[PDB]
């Protein structure tokens, strides 16, 4: 056991070290495309021509970098240009004003917020840089980060793994159904920020389902966890910060 | 005498995202700077206020980036601007006209270049790309990628691993005694011109110190090596190619 934790740890560590390269990747591109003279270019004079380059400069990059959607906001929050344009999903023309990665980039210049997709209904990292011009704001560059990749990996690797927010919220789940979940208590009169904070309303915020919980010596625990398709069994979690963010990554290994 | 044979083979799948992640974060920032008609106006029309411009241009992405330099060269092979531009070893001037990375550069439009750091000693990924004008090239736009990080993540797995090129030499690895060593035999006439490639010329280029071996099925093979911290022992061996580059990665599993 004191065998199994040791090897939970190193797994935790190196889920953690991924989901924190993967995050990273996807910042580079709102950090590039930020000072982008195009990007700039196009905000200052937005014609035609102008922003139809930029359609197509921003699908070359969500496909090379591999962002659900990369997407330029103007000055007062209407998408002017996105990777998505050629699709019947062409975010262009949208309003993201009531965005939060929108309007807190206006404000503090960066924002990164997880939140469900409006039209698609699909979670995931809006990562957001404004774009500035000599004396005085432009609009908005956003690249939305999808995890069902790091996702996908860890319910291949046979130890299951979620990550939750300060406030205490899964975001990234190997196992679906507990996305939204909690991991604290949680606060009553904190609900529909946060409901509103994730673009949901509607979600759980109900316990992740894990009953008879031991606390250990080394700091694991044990847990019984009814997970999809299976009869219940027992777990051993470890947990580990995942470095450059603020979020725990918690992990079960099959007793 | 069972298959963790199943364990090796995602152990090092994990190992070769967390090492595309890693680059890829990287090949976004030549990716576009190099069509970036700051980049190109300096290059085309340089003048000191141009040209600070871009140093702390380049300063700020680098320190985002967690790049180890980024850096912008002429035509004729001398670098204008460089991310290192007010510290001591400031890249700024130096001749470059003759560096792989530069010349492949200028004649493919982009390249991904092993070196060893002239005067830093340190080896890393050089990725870079043509900057093209209305002209024809007029310079190159370099950012240097090094693996500390992720030789620490994989000497912390317990499970050594290392990339080989398609020359069969080692590159990155998770011991340092063992960079620049060699799955291949590699035939007399051609040490010379792959150290030169490397930069560095006093690479060992001698055969991975441990044999053993037989195949297979797959392609497998048993293994016992060389290392420290505990004599000698017994390793299986998985072999995996890591997606987006020509890399192998290969690792090995104490008994």
């Not at 390269?21 to 930020?34: D, I, K, S, T, Y």
Request: glycine letters at 8%; proline letters at 7%.
């Amino acid at each position: 056991l004191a065998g199994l934790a040791g090897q939970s740890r190193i797994d935790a560590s190196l889920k953690a070290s991924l989901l924190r390269a993967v995050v990273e990747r996807q910042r580079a591109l709102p950090l590039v495309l930020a000072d982008d003279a195009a990007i700039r270019g196009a905000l200052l004079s937005p014609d035609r021509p102008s922003l139809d380059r930029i359609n197509r400069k921003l699908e070359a990059l969500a496909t090379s970098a591999e962002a659900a959607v990369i997407y330029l906001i103007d000055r007062s929050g209407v998408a002017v240009a996105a990777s998505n344009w050629q699709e019947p999903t062409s975010f262009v023309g949208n309003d993201y004003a009531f965005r939060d990665y929108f309007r807190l980039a206006v404000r503090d210049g960066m924002a990164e917020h997880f939140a469900m997709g409006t039209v698609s209904n699909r979670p995931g990292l809006y990562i957001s840089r404004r774009v500035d011009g000599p004396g005085g704001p432009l609009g908005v560059i956003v690249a939305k980060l999808e995890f069902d990749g790091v996702e996908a990996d860890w319910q291949a690797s046979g130890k299951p793994a979620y990550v939750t927010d300060r406030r205490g919220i899964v975001l990234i789940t190997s196992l679906p159904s507990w996305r939204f979940m909690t991991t604290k208590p949680i606060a009553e009169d904190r609900l529909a920020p946060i409901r509103e904070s994730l673009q949901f309303g509607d979600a759980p915020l109900l316990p992740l389902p894990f009953r008879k919980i031991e606390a250990r010596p080394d700091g694991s625990s044990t847990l019984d966890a009814l997970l999809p398709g299976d009869s219940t069994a027992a777990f051993l979690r470890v947990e580990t910060m995942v470095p450059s963010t603020n979020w725990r990554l918690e992990q079960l290994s099959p007793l």
